[PDB]
DNA sequence: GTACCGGACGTTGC
DNA sequence: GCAACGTCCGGTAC
């Protein structure tokens, strides 16, 4: 249950136990080739109130790709239920043109929600870009 | 406590 | 083609 990020082949790290907040850890590669980790816990301030998967790790994950100029990353988070079917449809709009996240669930999650998947998902970016917020 | 609410994207039952 | 449906989000309301 390995994973290729350019020439690294990484496992899922030891993830805190699900309290109920997805956790998760993501992982790049820098510009001089060594890999680099983040880890992101769901649901802070967004500058995107008006994406429903946007306070999630992997809408996280992929405004931070964004943010960075990232083109390759990787996220393993701990939530049982899988991915949500907010991300599943919207991570690709997140993300930028071509950039290229791979979002991988707890081993045997089981989604249980319309649009969940419980398992590794790789969303490649399109050319749309995230509407910015009013104040409704 | 709790049952919607609300922008938003793609899926899909009618 | 139209509209239901999906977060634990943050927010108003019984
Ligand atoms: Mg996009
Ligand atoms: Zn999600």
Do not use: W
């Not at 030891?14 to 993501?26: C, D, I, K, M």
């Not at 100029?69 to 599943?88: D, Q």
């Not at 999650?109 to 749309?128: D, L, M």
């Amino acid at each position: 249950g390995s994973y290729a990020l350019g020439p690294y082949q990484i496992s899922a790290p030891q993830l805190p136990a699900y309290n109920g907040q997805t956790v998760g850890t993501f992982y790049y590669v820098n510009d001089a080739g060594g890999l680099e980790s983040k880890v992101f816990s769901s649901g802070g301030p967004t500058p995107y109130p008006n994406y429903a998967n946007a306070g999630h790790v992997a809408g996280q994950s992929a405004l931070f790709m964004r943010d960075n100029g990232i083109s390759e990353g990787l996220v393993f988070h701990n939530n049982p239920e899988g991915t949500c079917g907010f991300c599943v449809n919207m991570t690709e709009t997140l993300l930028p043109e071509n950039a290229k996240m791979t979002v991988v669930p707890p081993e045997g999650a089981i989604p249980v929600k319309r649009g969940a998947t419980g398992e590794t998902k790789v969303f490649t970016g399109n050319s749309n870009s995230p509407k910015s917020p009013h104040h409704h």
